C-alpha cells in the first residue's frame, strides 16, 4: 500500500490570445473572419455580401454596418461606405483593395499584396502572424508598407488612414506620421492548455486525489469550456478535484483556458502536481512557461 509516483504532462496548446473589451475584433483570427465564425452582432452587422469570381470583383456595401468577405479569393475590391464595416479579403497572392470609407471599420487583409484604406474614423487592420513578423516603411504617399514573408516570399501590404493594427500577439496603436506601433495593454489574455496524468499502479487500488496548479497570476480564472473551475488567489494556486471519472487510472483534461488579467504578469510558469493515492500519497509535476 505504497503510493507509486504517477506521470503528469502539462501542455500549452497554443499561444496566449489577448482580448480587449473595447475592440470586438480582438480574439478573431483572419480564418474565423473569412469563414464567418464570429459574432456579427458584436459589430452591429445589418447586411452581408460575398464576392463571386476568382478574379478582381468590386462589391459596394451600404450606408449601414456591412460584412463583405472574399469567399473565392482573387484580390477583390470592397467599398464599405458609411457605417462600421467588416471587410474581409482573401489569401490569394493578388491583393485585395479594402476601402473602409467613413465609420470605424475592421479591414482584414488575409495573405497577399493587399491595399487597406481605413478612410475617416478610427479603423483597425487585422494582419496574420505576430507584430514581430512585420517590417514597417514610410511611403512617399503618406501610407505605409507592411512587409511580411508569406510562403517563404516577401510580400508588401499598404495601409492608409489606419489607427490600429491587430496581430496574433495583440492590438497596437499606429502612429500615422512615423509608423511607430505601440502595444495596447489587453483586458485579459487567454492561455489554452491540457493536462494528462496516469497512475503507474494499474490494479485500481490507486486513484488521482487531485491536480494542484501553481505559479498562476492572482485574479486569473480557469475555465473548462463553459465551466468556471476557479479563480486564482494571492497564493497563485488552484486544487482541481472531480473533473474526471474518479475510478480512472488515466486523466486527460482538455478545453482548459487560463484567463489572466492584462494588468498581471506577461510571463509565468504554470506548474501541475498530479497526486496519486491509496492512504499514502505520491506526486509528480511538469511545468510550461506562458508568455
Ligand atoms: Ca501503490
Ligand atoms: Ca473574388
Ligand atoms: Ca480576395
Ligand atoms: Ca457600410
Ligand atoms: Ca465604413
Ligand atoms: Ca488578401
Ligand atoms: Ca473608416
Ligand atoms: Ca481612419
Ligand atoms: Ca496496487
Amino acid at each position: 500500500a505504497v503510493a507509486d509516483k504517477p506521470v503528469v504532462d502539462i501542455s500549452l496548446t497554443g499561444n496566449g490570445v489577448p482580448l480587449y473589451t473595447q475592440y470586438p475584433s480582438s480574439g478573431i483570427s483572419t480564418g474565423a473572419f473569412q469563414s464567418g465564425s464570429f459574432n456579427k452582432g458584436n459589430f452591429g452587422i445589418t447586411s452581408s455580401f460575398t464576392d463571386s469570381t476568382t478574379t478582381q470583383d468590386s462589391v459596394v456595401g451600404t450606408s449601414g454596418n456591412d460584412y463583405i468577405v472574399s469567399v473565392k479569393g482573387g484580390g477583390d475590391y470592397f467599398v464599405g461606405g458609411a457605417g462600421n464595416d467588416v471587410l474581409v479579403g482573401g489569401n490569394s497572392v493578388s491583393g485585395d483593395t479594402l476601402d473602409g470609407g467613413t465609420g470605424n471599420d475592421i479591414l482584414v487583409a488575409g495573405l497577399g499584396g493587399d491595399t487597406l484604406f481605413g478612410g475617416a474614423g478610427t479603423d483597425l487592420a487585422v494582419l496574420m502572424g505576430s507584430r514581430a513578423n512585420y517590417v514597417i516603411e514610410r511611403r512617399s504617399d503618406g501610407g505605409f508598407n507592411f512587409l511580411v514573408k508569406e510562403n517563404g516570399v516577401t510580400i508588401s501590404k499598404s495601409l492608409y488612414d489606419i489607427e490600429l493594427v491587430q496581430f496574433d500577439d495583440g492590438i497596437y496603436q499606429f502612429n500615422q506620421t512615423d509608423g511607430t506601433l505601440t502595444a495596447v495593454q489587453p483586458s485579459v489574455v487567454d492561455y489554452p492548455f491540457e493536462i494528462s496524468a496516469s497512475l503507474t499502479d494499474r490494479d485500481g487500488s490507486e486513484q488521482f486525489d487531485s491536480l494542484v496548479l501553481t505559479g498562476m497570476p492572482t485574479g486569473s480564472t480557469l475555465y473548462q469550456g463553459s465551466t468556471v473551475l476557479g479563480t486564482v488567489g494571492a497564493d497563485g494556486k488552484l486544487t482541481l478535484t472531480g473533473l474526471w471519472n474518479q475510478s480512472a487510472l488515466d486523466v486527460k483534461l482538455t478545453g482548459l483556458t487560463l484567463r489572466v488579467p492584462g494588468s498581471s504578469a506577461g510571463q509565468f510558469d504554470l506548474k501541475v502536481e498530479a497526486i496519486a493515492k491509496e492512504v499514502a500519497t505520491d506526486q509528480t509535476s511538469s511545468a510550461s512557461d506562458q508568455d
Side-chain angles (χ1 to χ4, degrees):
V2 159
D4 298 13
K5 179 179 178 66
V7 303
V8 69
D9 173 78
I10 189 156
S11 296
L12 188 56
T13 55
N15 306 267
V17 177
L19 297 174
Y20 301 73
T21 202
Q22 71 274 43
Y23 301 124
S25 60
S26 64
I28 310 170
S29 64
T30 294
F33 276 121
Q34 289 171 331
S35 81
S37 292
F38 68 94
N39 188 348
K40 287 171 202 69
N42 290 346
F43 295 94
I45 302 299
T46 50
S47 309
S48 304
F49 301 101
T50 72
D51 67 325
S52 49
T53 86
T54 300
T55 194
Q56 299 187 16
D57 299 329
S58 299
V59 185
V60 186
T62 71
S63 82
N65 299 5
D66 306 308
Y67 175 56
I68 315 176
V69 56
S70 188
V71 191
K72 320 291 214 194
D76 304 314
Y77 173 37
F78 292 167
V79 172
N84 303 345
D85 300 306
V86 173
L87 308 179
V88 185
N91 300 325
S92 79
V93 160
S94 183
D96 306 286
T97 301
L98 308 180
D99 182 347
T102 60
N104 294 351
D105 309 298
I106 308 305
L107 296 196
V108 185
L111 301 180
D114 307 295
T115 306
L116 273 48
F117 286 108
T122 306
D123 307 294
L124 177 149
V126 182
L127 304 182
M128 298 167 78
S130 290
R131 164 58 183 89
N133 296 139
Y134 286 80
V135 181
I136 306 327
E137 306 179 310
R138 200 153 95 202
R139 297 171 50 94
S140 50
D141 57 8
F144 293 88
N145 297 335
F146 280 58
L147 326 162
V148 66
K149 297 183 179 189
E150 324 178 320
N151 304 313
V153 171
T154 290
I155 277 126
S156 190
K157 306 182 197 277
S158 35
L159 273 59
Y160 302 88
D161 306 299
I162 298 300
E163 290 73 23
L164 297 160
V165 183
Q166 178 175 313
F167 313 86
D168 296 339
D169 67 308
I171 290 170
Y172 295 71
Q173 278 181 330
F174 189 45
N175 183 300
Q176 292 187 62
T177 304
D178 70 17
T180 301
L181 285 167
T182 305
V184 181
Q185 179 178 101
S187 297
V188 302
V189 186
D190 282 359
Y191 297 100
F193 69 105
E194 289 192 344
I195 301 156
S196 72
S198 38
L199 303 177
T200 55
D201 190 326
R202 306 284 317 181
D203 50 48
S205 68
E206 285 187 9
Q207 321 186 324
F208 278 112
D209 167 47
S210 63
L211 300 177
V212 179
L213 295 171
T214 59
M216 292 173 292
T218 298
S220 303
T221 297
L222 189 61
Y223 292 88
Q224 193 172 32
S226 308
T227 323
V228 180
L229 297 182
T231 299
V232 176
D235 65 4
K237 176 160 85 153
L238 284 183
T239 297
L240 307 177
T241 69
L243 300 187
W244 54 96
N245 163 356
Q246 190 55 38
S247 312
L249 291 295
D250 311 288
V251 171
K252 175 151 158 187
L253 288 178
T254 66
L256 299 181
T257 310
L258 193 67
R259 177 166 288 186
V260 179
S263 78
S264 284
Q267 204 217 306
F268 62 93
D269 296 308
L270 190 50
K271 187 206 258 203
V272 63
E273 211 192 340
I275 307 173
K277 92 155 206 160
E278 49 196 11
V279 189
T281 65
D282 207 11
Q283 309 91 12
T284 194
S285 61
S286 191
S288 49
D289 181 287
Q290 297 191 320
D291 268 3

